[PDB]
Design a protein around this nucleic acid. Structure first.
Ligand SMILES: [Mg+2]
Ligand SMILES: [Zn+2]
Ligand SMILES: [Zn+2]
Lengths: 49, 32, 115, 184, 147, 56, 140, 262, 49, 391, 69
RNA sequence: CCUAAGAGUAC
């Protein structure tokens, strides 16, 4: 019934939690608050795999 | 049943799920 | 850890007695009897048989805490009738009824053929 | 599930039919000689599809096939459902109960509960005591808690026989009375 | 705790003779307060108790899947076919006097989990013990006999 | 804040709470083990020389 | 010990309300038209129908002999003679209000353990009713 | 003269009877005494010599403690608390031995029929585990893979169900009175009709149904209790009832003895 | 064990007081469990597949 | 320990179990349950500290709090429900149970009260027995809605010289309320007498409830056929009114209320209609519920539950709101991929027309999960922020 | 793990009815309820004792013994 | 022994 998917590090069963992140190479445009001089910001987290 | 092309019922959808869990499992994402 | 031994529910401890009687100062001719290592099984039976008495004015029992197996029974009888005498008569009646019931049950069981 | 036009019946219907279900059942029964019909066979024949959240923005999904695919004296005890008044479906849900996770698939009748209670049970079924593994006798774990007599639930879901819950239960069926008996 | 977020600790433990009993001699393994039901609205607890009663009486498994066509009325009718009150209420008798309870008790099997939080692992007392080396104050934690 | 305004103190206990309808409002049930660990210093006085001796 | 009040009433209405053992009856005196009664009665222990004649008496004590409660209630021994032996339904209560309904009419309120009674009539025959405990005795 | 009894069903493990002309308190006291006050024999000490099984030592000890043992002559045995021996002797205990070995390639089922009495019973009728099924094998105590061994010795003392439920000889005791609710001791919960929604008890055939117009009988007390006692197997169910009556009478006589001697 | 092996973690502070990332988003339908999350600081930030 | 009533001086009672045991009435100031709560105990180590602990921080002295010049402790949970059931006019107690209940009162003077009914059978009412616990010399007069000097509904409260003249005893009388029995007793006879009253009332009511019984079940959440049909009719009527409003808005015929946009006015109208629908269906269900309904009895006593709980369990869960608004369009212009674009119907934007008894459809379940998630997040943020603010 | 000896609620011995139950299910092709009624389990306490049991010992017996004689 | 991290318990 043991399903695996974990590592044995120093005899201890360690599991790697799925780390959530913002997707790369996508254009996202965000409105900004009144105090900021910039009103809209269009950003891409450009990354080559 | 007799008609191979007959529409499936809601119960039959639990067969497909079973098939899925027969090939993937529960920790298929980690292993893959 | 803090769990008391189960036999403390029915075994009398060292330095304590089954019955202790204290006169009640609230009403005349009234006593309070503390029964140790007893529970509702005896309390309800004794209370009902005491209430069957015609000269008993008050009869009640209470188990002050389910943790401890003991109960207090208050008996108040008419003038000239000792509450201890009322308890004696109630216990005697209970014994007589139980003996009659045992005899009747034996006689009825002896009539069976499929047992 | 993939839904096609199905010009023979003239209405939207699932691409999966009773023949594919029969082949899947035959494979499952043989596991307990014919060509193996696994999940990959459905994937490679255009029967089932993988849709992510981006593609899911551009599809319309039927919650159940029996009540939404066919075009339109009811039980008063049943919950009120809607037909959505539309027939342009592209995909169909395999089963709604598959939106729940491993911990939530253990809850009996989660739709009859208030959602914070479901969250409490999900966070609390991991603290439940049972059999974590069958080889606990050969494992030197730091702490292990095992039930003497684990019992499979009387109220069991269809999704909990994929989680091996009936094989490794984490609770007991106790006779419960809901009463103000003694004030304790 | 049940599978519906009904957590609770054991208040008192009564023996079988003190527990309320049905006309068939069945006594509950657990007695839970009614007041946990209305505010928390764990109707699924009651439905699963009724379904488990029916499943135990009939031997079939109770299908407690979320979005199926299993209604309370059907379970109640199945229970009524088995000779019990359809809503799960049973006439119970007080264990101390044997008299009938004026109110009938919701009675039936329910799936309970034992949680990891036992009282023996949480009881802790300290009159005088080890002190911190720097601040000369009692140490932290019940594993160190702390304060 | 961690050692002067609030500090760890002795003669203290902590445990789970359960309800008791048979206790008074001002009465708290204390486990026997906790009562055995927590202690109070009673000054030896002619009025209570006897009972204290028994406890000793 | 003597009867503070006595009359004959006809029941015009029986109101069960939300109760299965207690009903509130309204009755009109068959002799004096200014006397009316509202009374909670255990119908389970004393059934009452509409248009029923009830003899109603209010007394200070049940003993036949004049007075020479502060003494605990005792179960009735065999051979005990009391006014209650002549009636069907006996209650014991306290008077908690005396209201001036009009120039002649006064109303007396009684509470028998929560069973409420209101007796309204001219003060010429309700003057014996005073603020104390009383027994209500009813016969059919 | 007194409490009358009429018994409907007589079985080896059940007795169903009617208890008439008796008080409610007496019937409840008899039921409670049967549940918790009847002395019985059960395993109370377990010495484990070899345990290569997959079950914990105290797990097997707990299972053994729940094995019903014959207790017909349990009154001839003495409690271990009031015996002059050091720990256990032949006047207050029965010694059994469970010795099993897995010499079969298949699973070897260790039952209670392999519990062998070692102590000399002195002619009493106690000690034997109660066998009920037609196969002859008792309660399944353990299972052995090939090469697994389980050797242990059990000391069985007498005890009442109050100290531990493993000494309870009464199983479930059905106790009902006033099936027609003529005493109005219950207020039936209902949605539409209380008569239709509440199934009639089987005992309703034994009492006259109400006339639906008769006034409530406020003088009626509680009598005619329908009681079904079940026997685990330690003692016959008729002996269960007789010994319950005996123990209740003993308790009342002890109250009298204390009152007279003080 | 099954829940831990299918656990996803969002690395957004945890002591922040803006509740939007912790909300059950509509796009979470069928991808993460609607009701399986710690009640403490990790509410919504820790998700289960 | 947010306030001084969360840190009070008790008297030790040594018990043979591993848990602290405290009265049910004192749990309200402590904000304590028994689902795993841990509590702390400190012992004074000198006579001065012991004496000031007994004379300043004692539980009876904290009965009336300076926080709201009203009692902080009261009759709660089972003792409340029982005290409502015991003080009903239907509740008559026979001689044996009367004697037991009188003995269960520790300070009972030893006189058996004259029965409320003497012939043809001596019966005491519950009010008479409960009046024994009330100390002599206490007068309380509270007039509820519509009560007269005669009490046809047995509401209100009149106690004269320690005897309950009339009124069903419930949360307003023995609860933590200003002008109630607790306040009057502690301001007339003293805190010790008030604590003794707590004990006596708890003992007598708990004994009566033990020998009477109280439960709750699935049948208590079930309304009969005609009421269910009327609830469905109310829901359908509300949905039809929402559809009419949607037709008016989509035809631009809708006019914006001053101070908000057209969309906000439409949302306000739709939410108001759905909320009043849920309220009306719940009121229909609650009126349908008989006096023997257990949830109804608990709500009437005030021990636990509310009208909204009955409405959600029997009639309709209602409208799920996130951040004070209906379910937002997480997907492009739609809440879920199971609905078409630009669907502003109640079911699309999170209206749960099904009750908990009937179960929830998958979309309704997901929307309810979103609402509960918001509730949990709000609770955590609120407790953290309140701790900071209090410090 | 292994079939409990006695029903938790009432105390009826159910540990001697496990192999008979499995034989009835396998050899006689009965359903669960009829087998439970055949074994004499009439109260649903005993019925849930026998019906809901998970025989984990069969799993534990698959591993080779830690100490083999 | 210290530090850090993680998992939870009750609000
Ligand atoms: Mg809590
Ligand atoms: Zn010996
Ligand atoms: Zn059983």
């Amino acid at each position: 019934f043991d399903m695996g998917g974990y590592f044995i590090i120093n005899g201890s069963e360690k599991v790697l939690i799925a780390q959530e992140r913002s997707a790369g190479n996508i254009v996202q445009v965000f409105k900004k608050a009144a105090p900021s001089p910039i009103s809209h910001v269009a950003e891409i987290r450009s990354a080559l795999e | 049943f007799e008609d191979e092309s007959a529409p499936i019922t809601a119960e039959d959808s639990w067969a497909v799920i079973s098939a899925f869990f027969r090939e993937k499992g529960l920790v298929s994402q980690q292993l893959d | 850890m803090n769990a008391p031994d189960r036999f403390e529910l029915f075994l009398l401890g060292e330095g304590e007695s089954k019955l202790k009687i204290d006169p009640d100062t609230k009403a005349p001719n009234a006593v309070v009897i503390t029964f140790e290592k007893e529970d509702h099984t005896l309390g309800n039976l004794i209370r009902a048989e005491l209430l069957n008495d015609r000269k008993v004015l008050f009869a009640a029992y209470k188990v002050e805490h389910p943790f401890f197996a003991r109960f207090k029974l208050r008996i108040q009888t008419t003038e000239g009738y000792d509450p201890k005498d009322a308890l004696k008569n109630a216990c005697n009646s209970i014994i007589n009824k139980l003996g009659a019931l045992k005899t009747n049950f034996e006689t009825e069981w002896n009539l069976q053929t499929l047992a | 599930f993939i839904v096609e036009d199905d010009e023979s019946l003239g209405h939207k219907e699932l691409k999966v039919r009773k023949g594919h279900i029969a082949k899947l059942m035959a494979t499952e029964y043989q596991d307990i000689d014919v060509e193996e019909y696994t999940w990959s066979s459905l994937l490679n024949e255009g029967l089932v599809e993988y849709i992510d959240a981006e593609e899911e923005e551009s599809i319309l999904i039927a919650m159940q096939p029996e009540d939404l695919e066919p075009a339109e004296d009811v039980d008063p005890a049943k919950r009120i459902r809607v037909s959505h008044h539309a027939t342009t479906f592209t995909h169909c849900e395999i089963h709604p109960s598959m939106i729940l996770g491993v911990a939530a698939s253990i809850i009996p009748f989660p739709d009859h509960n208030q959602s914070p209670r479901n969250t409490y049970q999900s966070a609390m079924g991991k603290q439940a005591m049972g059999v974590f593994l069958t080889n606990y006798n050969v494992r030197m774990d730091t702490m292990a808690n095992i039930l003497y007599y684990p019992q499979k639930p009387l109220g069991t879901t269809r999704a909990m026989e994929y989680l091996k819950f009936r094989e490794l239960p984490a609770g007991q069926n106790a006779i419960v009375a809901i009463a103000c008996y003694s004030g304790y | 705790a049940s599978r519906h977020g009904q957590k609770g600790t054991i208040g008192i433990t009564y023996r079988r003779e003190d527990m309320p009993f049905t006309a068939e001699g069945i006594v509950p393994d657990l007695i839970i307060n009614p007041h946990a039901i209305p505010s928390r609205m764990t109707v699924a607890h009651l439905i699963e108790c009724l379904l488990s009663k029916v499943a135990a009486l009939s031997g079939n498994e109770g299908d407690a899947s979320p979005f199926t066509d299993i209604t309370v009325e059907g379970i109640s009718k199945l229970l009524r076919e088995h000779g019990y009150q359809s809503r799960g209420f049973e006439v119970m008798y007080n264990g101390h006097t044997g008299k009938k309870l004026m109110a009938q008790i919701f009675f039936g099997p329910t799936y309970y989990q034992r949680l990891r939080h036992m009282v023996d692992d949480k009881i802790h007392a300290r009159a005088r013990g080890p002190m911190q080396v720097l601040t000369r104050q009692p140490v932290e934690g019940r594993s160190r006999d702390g304060g | 804040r961690g050692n002067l305004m609030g500090k760890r103190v002795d003669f203290s206990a902590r445990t789970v709470i359960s309800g008791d309808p048979n206790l008074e409002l001002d009465q708290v049930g204390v486990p026997k083990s906790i009562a055995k660990t927590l202690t109070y210093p009673e000054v030896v006085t002619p009025y209570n020389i006897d009972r204290l001796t028994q406890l000793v | 010990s003597n009867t503070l009040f006595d009359d004959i009433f006809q029941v015009s209405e029986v109101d069960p309300g939300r109760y299965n053992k207690v009903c509130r009856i309204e009755a009109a005196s068959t002799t004096q038209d200014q006397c009316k009664l509202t009374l909670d009665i255990n119908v389970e222990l004393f059934p009452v129908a509409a248009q029923d004649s009830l003899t109603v008496t209010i007394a200070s004590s049940l003993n036949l002999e004049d007075t020479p409660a502060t003494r605990s209630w005792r179960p009735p021994q065999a051979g005990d003679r009391s006014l209650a032996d002549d009636y069907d339904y006996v209650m014991y209560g306290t008077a908690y209000k005396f209201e001036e309904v009009s120039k002649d009419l006064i109303a007396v309120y009684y509470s028998f353990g929560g069973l409420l009674m209101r007796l309204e009539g001219n003060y010429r025959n309700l003057n014996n009713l005073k603020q104390e405990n009383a027994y209500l005795l009813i016969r059919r | 003269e007194g409490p009358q009894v009429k018994i409907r069903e007589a079985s080896k493990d059940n007795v169903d009877f009617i208890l008439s002309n008796v008080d409610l308190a007496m019937a409840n006291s008899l039921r409670r005494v049967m549940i918790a006050e009847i002395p019985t024999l059960a395993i109370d000490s377990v010495e484990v010599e070899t345990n290569t099984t997959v079950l914990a030592d105290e797990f097997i000890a707990h299972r053994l403690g729940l094995i019903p043992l014959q207790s017909m002559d349990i009154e001839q045995l003495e409690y271990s608390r009031d015996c002059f021996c050091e720990d256990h002797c032949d006047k207050c205990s029965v010694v059994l031995t469970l010795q099993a070995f897995g010499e079969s390639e298949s699973t070897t089922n260790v039952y209670s029929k392999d519990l062998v009495i070692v102590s000399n019973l002195m002619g009493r009728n106690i000690g034997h585990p109660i066998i009920q099924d037609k196969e002859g094998n008792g309660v399944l105590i353990c299972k052995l893979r090939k090469g697994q061994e389980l050797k242990l010795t059990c000391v069985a003392k007498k005890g009442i169900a109050k100290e531990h439920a493993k000494w309870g000889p009464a199983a479930a005791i059905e106790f009902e009175y006033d099936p027609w609710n003529k005493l109005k001791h219950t207020d039936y919960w209902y949605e539409q009709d209380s008569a239709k929604e509440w199934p009639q008890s089987k005992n309703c055939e034994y009492e006259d149904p109400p006339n639906e117009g008769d006034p409530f009988d406020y003088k009626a007390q509680a009598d005619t209790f329908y009681m079904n006692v079940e026997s685990v197997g330690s003692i016959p169910v008729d002996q269960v009832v007789v010994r319950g009556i005996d123990t209740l009478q003993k308790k009342v006589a002890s109250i009298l003895l204390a009152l007279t001697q003080m | 064990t099954l829940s831990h092996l299918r656990r996803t973690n969002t690395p957004i502070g945890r002591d922040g007081k803006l509740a939007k990332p912790r909300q059950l988003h509509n796009t979470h339908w069928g991808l993460v469990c609607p009701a399986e999350t710690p009640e403490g600081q990790a509410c919504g930030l820790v998700k289960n597949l | 320990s947010l306030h001084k009533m969360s840190m009070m001086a008790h008297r030790v009672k040594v018990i043979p179990y591993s848990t602290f045991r405290l009265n049910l009435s004192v749990t309200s100031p402590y904000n304590a349950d028994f689902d795993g709560d841990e509590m702390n105990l400190h012992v004074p180590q000198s006579e001065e500290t012991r004496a000031e602990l007994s004379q300043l921080c004692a539980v009876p002295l904290q009965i009336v709090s300076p926080q709201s010049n009203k009692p902080c402790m009261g009759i709660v949970q089972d003792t409340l429900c029982g005290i409502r059931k015991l003080t009903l006019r239907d509740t008559f107690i026979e001689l044996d149970q009367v004697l037991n209940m009188l003995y269960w009162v520790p300070d009972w003077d030893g006189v058996i009260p004259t029965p409320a009914i003497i012939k043809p059978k001596p019966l005491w009412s519950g009010k008479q027995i409960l009046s024994v616990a009330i100390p002599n010399g206490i007068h309380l007069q509270r007039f509820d809605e519509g009560t007269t000097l005669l009490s046809p509904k047995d509401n209100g409260m009149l106690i004269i010289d320690g005897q309950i003249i009339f009124g069903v005893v419930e949360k307003k009388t023995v609860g933590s309320s200003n002008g109630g029995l607790i306040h009057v007793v502690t301001r007339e006879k003293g805190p010790q007498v008030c604590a003794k009253l707590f004990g006596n009332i708890q003992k007598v009511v708990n004994f009566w409830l033990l020998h009477n019984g109280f439960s709750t079940g699935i049948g208590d959440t079930i309304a009969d056929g005609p009421t269910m049909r009327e609830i469905t009719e109310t829901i359908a009527e509300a949905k039809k009114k929402v559809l009419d409003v949607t037709k008016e808005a989509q035809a631009n015929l809708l006019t914006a209320k001053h101070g908000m946009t057209l969309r906000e006015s439409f949302e306000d109208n739709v939410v108001r209609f759905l909320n009043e629908a849920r309220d009306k269906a719940g009121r229909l269900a609650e009126v349908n519920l008989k006096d023997l309904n257990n949830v109804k009895q608990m709500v009437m006593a005030g021990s636990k539950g509310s009208f909204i709980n009955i409405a959600q369990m029997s009639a309709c869960v209602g409208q799920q709101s996130v951040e004070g608004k209906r379910i937002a369009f997480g997907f492009v212009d739609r809440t879920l991929p199971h609905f078409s674009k630009d669907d502003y119907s109640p079911e699309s934007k999170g209206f749960v027309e099904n009750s908990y008894l009937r179960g929830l459809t998958p979309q309704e379940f997901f929307f309810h999960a979103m609402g509960g998630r918001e509730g949990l997040i709000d609770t955590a943020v609120k407790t953290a922020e309140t701790g900071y603010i209090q410090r | 793990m292994i079939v409990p000896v006695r029903c938790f609620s009432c105390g009826k011995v159910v540990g001697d009815k496990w192999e008979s139950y499995l034989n009835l299910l396998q050899e006689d092709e009965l359903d669960e309820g009829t087998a439970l009624s055949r074994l004499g389990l009439k109260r649903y306490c005993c019925r849930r004792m026998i019906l809901t049991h998970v025989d984990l010992i069969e799993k534990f017996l698959r591993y080779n013994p830690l100490e083999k004689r």
